[PDB]
Structures are given as structure tokens and as C-alpha cells.
Write a protein that binds this ligand. Sequence first.
Ligand SMILES: NS(=O)(=O)c1cc2c(cc1Cl)N[C@@H](C(Cl)Cl)NS2(=O)=O
Ligand SMILES: [Zn+2]
Ligand SMILES: [Zn+2]
Length: 256
Amino acid sequence: HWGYGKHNGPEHWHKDFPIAKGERQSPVDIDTHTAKYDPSLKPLSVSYDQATSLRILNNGHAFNVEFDDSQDKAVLKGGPLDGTYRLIQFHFHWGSLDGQGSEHTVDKKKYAAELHLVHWNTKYGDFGKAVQQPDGLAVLGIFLKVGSAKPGLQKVVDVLDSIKTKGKSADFTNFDPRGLLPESLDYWTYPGSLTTPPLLECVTWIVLKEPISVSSEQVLKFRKLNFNGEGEPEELMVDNWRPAQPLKNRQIKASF
Ligand SMILES: NS(=O)(=O)c1cc2c(cc1Cl)N[C@@H](C(Cl)Cl)NS2(=O)=O
Ligand SMILES: [Zn+2]
Ligand SMILES: [Zn+2]
């Protein structure tokens, strides 16, 4: 039943997922004046050159672009991380208007949307084992602002038509996620959680400083997707973001 509506929204998740009120919930507001540079942070290694995308799926709250994670084809290493983390999927969160949609905020600023590249710690063997551990997952988060089109995104935008409703999927091979990165890999990092139920506290968040630009036309096509299944009454897929959660006992570090 969970979702983003008035009766099943984030305000309600704690009832079925008590960890929602936990000590290391995501997302959070990034107070730039309180984040601290950490010169001990090693440089971030994004190695997506052999990434193998497979499929795109409308899961009822967003769409996932899924990848083959049977081997070390696309990985995240270095930065705050120990070991190797394999890309399993990416998705977005976006708003009903350009003034909202991101999950993380920067000095309370909300971007139009946010891209999450989800990776799991290969020493745990699979994703399911990984989300039983405090260092199981690493998510690369990238803000989207509305401006010029992102060429690298257009392929995704153009398949949306075919996965309009919940549980629809389409073939999605040969997509290169490198085309969704900004120039700079400067980041902020903190320990957190999934921002969707079950809200497991297993994530090392790495949030890039530099947003990517996407066109209004591109984001408009995101807002034409549906939460609902086929034949059901249309509920447009918008505002599928969880607001900022309390930082509690956590420090956000800057790589720059
Ligand atoms: N939003 S997020 O990046 O915290 C996130 C979302 C999903 C995750 C994992 C993470 Cl870390 N897993 C999936 C399962 Cl369907 Cl494989 N659901 S999700 O909401 O896309
Ligand atoms: Zn869902
Ligand atoms: Zn997400």
C-alpha cells in the first residue's frame, strides 16, 4: 500500500516500516557550511565502461533501468568506500513542478529531480545479503536541474511511452550510464538508508555537487508516467520523493 499520496505517503511509512524514524534515515539536507572537507577521502572511481543494461521497468512508483550484475562489468570504488560495489539499477525521483522533486537538498534547495545509481557491496555476494549490512550498498546521487537537454538521457525519455503503467517493462539494452554524469565527481558523503520502503539503513550515500541539466521537455515526459496499472484510473507519476529526514548523529563529509 505505501506510496506518495496523502493516505499512503512518507508521513505514513513508519506504521509498516518502523525504521523510518531511525537514526540514519535518508534523504537529508546538506548544509554546505557544516559539511567538512576530508582530505583522507580517496578519489572516486566510476567504472561503467562495460556496463550491461537489460531492461526498463515501471515499478509503480518510479522506473528502474536494470543492469546485469552477474560480474564486475560496471563498478563504483574508492571515495569513502571499501571494496567494490556493483551497479544493479538506476532510477529517478522527480516533482510535479520544477521547484521540487529531489530527495536530498543543498542548503534547503530542492532540485527538479534526482538520479540514483544503486550499487551493492560484492563481498556480500548478492543484493539481498547486502541489505542486511551497514555497508551493503552505495548510491551515487546526482541532481537534475531544468535547462539544456541531456543528450545521454534522451534514450530513457523515449522508451517511457512503452512503460506508462505499473508492471510494464521494456527491453533496454546497450544504454551507457556514463552519459548521465556531470563533469565533476566532487561529492558529499554520509551514512544513510534506502529512501523507499523498506528504508533499510545499509547505504553509503555519495551525492555529487554538480547537477546535470535536462530540458523541460525531458522532465515533462517523466511526469506523463502513471503510478496506476493499465485500465485503471490515471494517477500521474509525480512527486515520488521522500523529504529530508533528521541528520541525528551524523557528519556529512566533503571531497572538496
Ligand atoms: N532510493 S534509493 O536509491 O534509496 C533505492 C531505491 C530502491 C532500491 C534501493 C535503493 Cl538504495 N531497491 C529497489 C528494489 Cl526494486 Cl531492487 N527499489 S527502489 O525503490 O528502486
Ligand atoms: Zn512501488
Ligand atoms: Zn532513489
